[PDB]
Amino acid sequence: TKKRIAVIGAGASGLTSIKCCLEEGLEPVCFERTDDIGGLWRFQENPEEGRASIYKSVIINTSKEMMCFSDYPIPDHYPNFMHNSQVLEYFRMYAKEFDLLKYIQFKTTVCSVKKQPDFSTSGQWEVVTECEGKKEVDVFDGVMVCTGHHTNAHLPLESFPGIEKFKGQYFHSRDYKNPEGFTGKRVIIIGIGNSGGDLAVEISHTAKQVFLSTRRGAWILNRVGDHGYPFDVLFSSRFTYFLSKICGQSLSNTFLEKKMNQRFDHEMFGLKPKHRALSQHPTVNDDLPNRIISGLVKVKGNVKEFTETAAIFEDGSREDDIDAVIFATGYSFAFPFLEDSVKVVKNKVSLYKKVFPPNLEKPTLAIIGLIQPLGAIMPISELQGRWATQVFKGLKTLPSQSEMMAEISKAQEEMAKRYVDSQRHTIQGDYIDTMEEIADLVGVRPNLLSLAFTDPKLALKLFFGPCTPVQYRLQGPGKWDGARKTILTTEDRIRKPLMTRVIE
Amino acid sequence: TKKRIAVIGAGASGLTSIKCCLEEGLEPVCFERTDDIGGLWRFQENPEEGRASIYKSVIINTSKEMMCFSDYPIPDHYPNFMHNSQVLEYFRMYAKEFDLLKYIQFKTTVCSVKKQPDFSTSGQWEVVTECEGKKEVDVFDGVMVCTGHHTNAHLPLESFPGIEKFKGQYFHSRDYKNPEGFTGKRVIIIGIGNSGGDLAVEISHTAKQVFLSTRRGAWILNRVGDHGYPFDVLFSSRFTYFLSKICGQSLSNTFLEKKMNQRFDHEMFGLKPKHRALSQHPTVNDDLPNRIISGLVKVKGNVKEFTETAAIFEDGSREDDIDAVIFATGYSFAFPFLEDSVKVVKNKVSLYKKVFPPNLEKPTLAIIGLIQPLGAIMPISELQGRWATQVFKGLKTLPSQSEMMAEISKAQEEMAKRYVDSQRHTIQGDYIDTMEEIADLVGVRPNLLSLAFTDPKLALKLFFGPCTPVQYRLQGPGKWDGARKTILTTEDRIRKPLMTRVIE
Ligand SMILES: Cc1cc2nc3c(=O)[nH]c(=O)nc-3n(C[C@H](O)[C@H](O)[C@H](O)COP(=O)(O)OP(=O)(O)OC[C@H]3O[C@@H](n4cnc5c(N)ncnc54)[C@H](O)[C@@H]3O)c2cc1C
Ligand SMILES: Cc1cc2nc3c(=O)[nH]c(=O)nc-3n(C[C@H](O)[C@H](O)[C@H](O)COP(=O)(O)OP(=O)(O)OC[C@H]3O[C@@H](n4cnc5c(N)ncnc54)[C@H](O)[C@@H]3O)c2cc1C
Ligand SMILES: NC(=O)c1ccc[n+]([C@@H]2O[C@H](COP(=O)([O-])OP(=O)(O)OC[C@H]3O[C@@H](n4cnc5c(N)ncnc54)[C@H](OP(=O)(O)O)[C@@H]3O)[C@@H](O)[C@H]2O)c1
Ligand SMILES: NC(=O)c1ccc[n+]([C@@H]2O[C@H](COP(=O)([O-])OP(=O)(O)OC[C@H]3O[C@@H](n4cnc5c(N)ncnc54)[C@H](OP(=O)(O)O)[C@@H]3O)[C@@H](O)[C@H]2O)c1
Ligand SMILES: OC[C@H]1O[C@H](O)[C@H](O)[C@@H](O)[C@@H]1O
């Protein structure tokens, strides 16, 4: 009498959502609208309808040790910050090791997920799915939604009077792939998220002049941290977490801001914003400062008005003979197949722990990977998936509707106090906070106080070292044999791919 | 009556050597073998015989405020680290301001410069020159040699057994221009001078894999120094100079090395050499560490042997399916037109203050810009030129042959004690030491002790601020009226091109 779980999407979130089903003995059916896995990380030269488009050169901004699945370490020889193709290969490896591919039926789009007539007792969903033009209806005991949130382009043309008049080319970051078409041209980038940044430096290699236009400015991080350790291996350690907690937000901020200014002074470089370090989604770009100091990227304020030829800026300055404008203005999400269960408006959604609709008579619809962490999504989707599948079996249970809604509203409230008021700051999470939060719900949070005495060597690494995901496969339901071994050898794996010449 | 001076070459050194002549009332004839000025900084898509070839993307590693001519500051809006095109434009500006172009005859190569029969009394040179096939002979009262030293490729194929056997492409850095010739290829770079570095990162943008092969390793700097000030504006300040002098070499070294390790640990990154920071010509690359941590540049030891397909490395590791090898193995210099007078063998020459042959009955042959400074060459060539033209008249005089040769030998000796034993470390200079040394001989060293009392505001900048070249146009022979004004506004010009977006 095995519960059948629909997993929608076969990216990082889909893949782990299948594994998490199999591991609690549920039968996963996985629908994936394209002809392969990886979702966002499977680069193609052309954009595809209804799946995340990326550019060829993209290198992931989260260290391999911090983004691995908890029970499947990334290979020793893989670099600390992997190219999009290496992320994809690792996903393929994950899917072979846990035999996930057979449960996927590709080329299959999910049109509709409606609670059934008997939902108040059965908790079951009517999933409708088209496949090369032929419909199909099925019933399921639970649904895990693993569609992305970097798919539907946010192209706010309405807030750029005279863009309709502009006679150069202009398009969303989505459609950017390589800089060939920009040799010796003058290009404006709108927005200073990681798309803005990546494109501003890349296009500046070929282009005559790139302008990086920001309406706010940005605090700007480097993945090459102190001593060349990955910045997230350093910042996301339980010790740094504890130091942050006693020191408070505004002092943490002053530390981080003063750190970033030592690298380059955001005021002198024209990038300094009115907000604080932790009030914005981190923009990571080690190359941007060096391009700015050479004039090949020019930091600008917001474009107020476009002509046939030019941009006018909020400060009355003007830039002429503009060949192309790219809107790195980011993405909005929605659920066309769930316009009954889950509602989103301008990236505002209400979900308990970012996962469960609170207004469900049964807890049988999980939303996986709908978070913007200061960290990797894959490891959080996995914990979301461990938890999700447990409440599908009734091994764990949700609070009452009204107390779910208090936590939801409490979260939206402090997120709104903390983060700059923009559509991209609606689902922010911190990495350690989030991993612990969901780990505690699954009962796999490592007992670090006991281990202090029962194993002082492990205990030390767990605390003073990086808060690696493998940490959450030590104890509890999904307990993994080789967690302790891998957790201790985490240094070796960070160094393996860098000691390619002997020094001694 | 007024002495005629042959200036050989019309790059940075030629251009300033003409101006230095005009300013001591001498008649310059300038022979340039090419059809234009700029020498090394005039990029063309094809390499040209007997003039420095560079790559399209080259950005100068010395700050604008540290490389300007002493009496012609670079415009406000020009960036702190200029692209090769902007260096060239600035030279064109210099040549307009001081009306130098009319004294150049282009397409004219100097074949021979021989001391004349009456040289022990007349001090005159037989300069022979071909111009579109037809020779021409002339006599001169002095010769300033401004041929470069980054023209004749050093391609040491003999020390790569099996390169004759290799079936991919291979060429010297000289012939490199763009990375698009390497898309999806596996490329090995020999050498980690600035060409090695530049190409290793550039080619890694298109290439499947780049390997950066060094037989030594290298200490590696960043142009974006503390708070995003140009590193040379910070390191080359009389104050830093004095701090260095009391602390000694080994302590200075430990400071610089510990500084570079904070950015990235040269041991972990596999770049750390057995020598010290100041024992090697500085390799500057802000972008290299980020490419190494992503695997797109792989640090290797020396190639011991090439096959049809592969490189074998000094540590017995092998890399297969290698499409292309670029020898960034640097340059040798020589004087084909001066074999009678000046002897150069594997970059070892004997010249008093790097300028004067010591064995000359008259001091009427100056060698301009034959130095490898921890700084800009242009400003040193200029001071060399001020001095040179003074000793051509009778304003200044050289020591006796015997005491010149003791100083020459003393210089070669301590240079050999300090620097790693290699062809490119035969003419190393320190910037401040060298500027002061030559300034003192011209009597234009600024009297900073006097100014302490005569002008404490200026005195402070001269000491605590950057040791800008304009400093040496304050007092003495060539005195410039607008020096003090520019020296004080030096911060403004560093910031002008970076505050392109409103802060307040
Ligand atoms: C340029 C860029 C860089 C990024 N870098 C990082 C990073 O460094 N670290 C990080 O943690 N995150 C990063 N992200 C965020 C990124 O989205 C996540 O890392 C990761 O892609 C999450 O994948 P997912 O499986 O949750 O969603 P996706 O990868 O988008 O997977 C969704 C899948 O569902 C399919 N699908 C869509 N609609 C349907 C439907 N109706 N029915 C069936 N299938 C459907 C899609 O075709 C796709 O295969 C980046 C995003 C971008 C755009
Ligand atoms: C990629 C690269 C980057 C560099 N970056 C820097 C830097 O950042 N800072 C720095 O200070 N230095 C740098 N250098 C060093 C460089 O040598 C100087 O910047 C500067 O260009 C030297 O100028 P020059 O006039 O001494 O030589 P060149 O510019 O080489 O001038 C030589 C001229 O003489 C002509 N010539 C040669 N032989 C004859 C002949 N027999 N008769 C007539 N004409 C002749 C040539 O055609 C040419 O016009 C760099 C070098 C390279 C290759
Ligand atoms: N691995 C990588 O290197 C990499 C590369 C690219 C992207 N990413 C990831 O991809 C995700 C989204 O990418 P993104 O950078 O395109 O998204 P983003 O962070 O939403 O970028 C949006 C940028 O555009 C600005 N903007 C938005 N609307 C605007 C308007 N109407 N007018 C003017 N300016 C406007 C934003 O300012 P506000 O602050 O006002 O919103 C912001 O600077 C992020 O999770 C990021 O981590 C990663
Ligand atoms: N503005 C810029 O960005 C820029 C760019 C490029 C060049 N430049 C300048 O132009 C000048 C030329 O520099 P470059 O990189 O062309 O040459 P370089 O400084 O002479 O360095 C050559 C490299 O090749 C190595 N090498 C030499 N012979 C070798 C051999 N037989 N086997 C293996 N390796 C060998 C050297 O090692 P050793 O240490 O053993 O000599 C060194 O690492 C330099 O002053 C540089 O600063 C500036
Ligand atoms: O059409 C979208 C764009 O694709 C690529 O990014 C090209 O470089 C660009 O020229 C083109 O306009």
Ligand SMILES: OC[C@H]1O[C@H](O)[C@H](O)[C@@H](O)[C@@H]1O
């Ligand atoms: O933000 C206000 C306060 O928050 C925390 O309680 C800190 O311990 C304290 O030092 C800080 O001033």
